Amino acid sequence: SYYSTLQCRNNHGHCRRLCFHGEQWIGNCNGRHQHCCK
């Protein structure tokens, strides 16, 4: 599925293994250890 990845997109986040400084871990994208970072 891509639903969670797409929702990261819709939320203006980025799917990352680790969130960058200043970014909040607001969800997960699809895939393994793909975190939605905003």
Author numbering: 1 to 38
Paper text:
To understand the structural basis of CpoBD13 activity, we determined its atomic structure using X-ray crystallography. A single copy of CpoBD13 was found in the asymmetric unit, with clear and continuous density observed for the entire protein chain. CpoBD13 adopts a fold comprising the family-defining structural elements observed in mammalian β-defensins comprising a single α-helix and a three-stranded β-sheet, which are connected via three disulphide bonds. A Dali analysis of CpoBD13 revealed that human β-defensin-2 (HBD-2) is the closest structural homologue in the Protein Data Bank (PDB), with a rmsd of 0.8 Å (Z-score 6.2) over 40 Cα atoms, and a peptide sequence identity of 26% (only I26 and K38 are conserved in addition to the cysteine residues that form the structurally critical disulphide bonds). An overlay of the two defensin structures revealed that residue H35 of CpoBD13 was located in the same position as the key lipid binding residue K36 in HBD-2. We surmised that if the activity of CpoBD13 is as conserved with HBD-2 as its tertiary structure, the co-localisation of these amino acids could indicate that histidine may play a role in CpoBD13–lipid interactions. Our findings reveal that despite limited primary sequence identity, the three-dimensional structure of CpoBD13 bears a striking resemblance to HBD-2, suggesting strong evolutionary conservation of the β-defensin structure between humans and reptiles.
